[PDB]
Design a protein around this ligand. Structure first.
Ligand SMILES: CNc1ncnc2c1ncn2C1CC1
Ligand SMILES: [Cl-]
Ligand SMILES: [Cl-]
Length: 149
């Protein structure tokens, strides 16, 4: 499997959700919204990528012990949208996503991948919109895709 070799235009972020309901809504309607500073990071990455490669999102519910799937950013952030569509009313705005994997991957499968841009911490100890260096992101995606147990 060498699909990901020679991929240079791609950026990958961790998405954390306190709410399982928000995960289910995102899957159903292919939309997401982050914090203000999270939206700004994702919007900048999406817009500067300019359709040259994907912005992937690695989703995990806080405290759950596993990742729950992978989606791709499919639009810029619209900051002025209906309020209160998520579990909490904190989030302002909306962007499109396309879910790629919906599958539980235990943190045990991924905790040995460490992020040089986050103090060598395990990728499983990231906060919302932590960016993942491309070479580590490829390793995470291969583990998520190949997981079956
Ligand atoms: C609809 N978006 C969201 N829903 C629930 N929690 C969120 C979130 N975006 C960031 N967080 C927290 C850091 C976990
Ligand atoms: Cl809306
Ligand atoms: Cl977080």
């Amino acid at each position: 499997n060498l699909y990901f070799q020679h991929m240079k235009h791609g950026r990958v972020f961790i998405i954390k959700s306190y709410s399982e309901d928000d995960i289910h809504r995102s899957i159903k309607y292919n939309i997401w919204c982050s914090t203000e500073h999270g939206n700004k990071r994702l919007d900048a990455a999406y817009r500067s990528m300019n359709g040259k490669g994907p912005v992937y999102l690695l989703f995990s519910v806080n405290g759950s012990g596993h990742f729950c799937g992978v989606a791709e950013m499919k639009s810029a952030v619209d900051y002025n949208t209906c309020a209160g569509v998520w579990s909490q009313d904190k989030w302002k705005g909306r962007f499109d996503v396309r879910w790629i994997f919906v599958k539980d991957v235990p943190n045990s499968q991924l905790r040995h991948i460490r992020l040089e841009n986050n103090e060598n911490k395990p990728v499983t100890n990231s906060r919302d919109t932590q960016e993942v260096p491309l070479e580590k992101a490829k390793q995470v995606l291969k583990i998520i895709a190949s997981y079956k147990h």
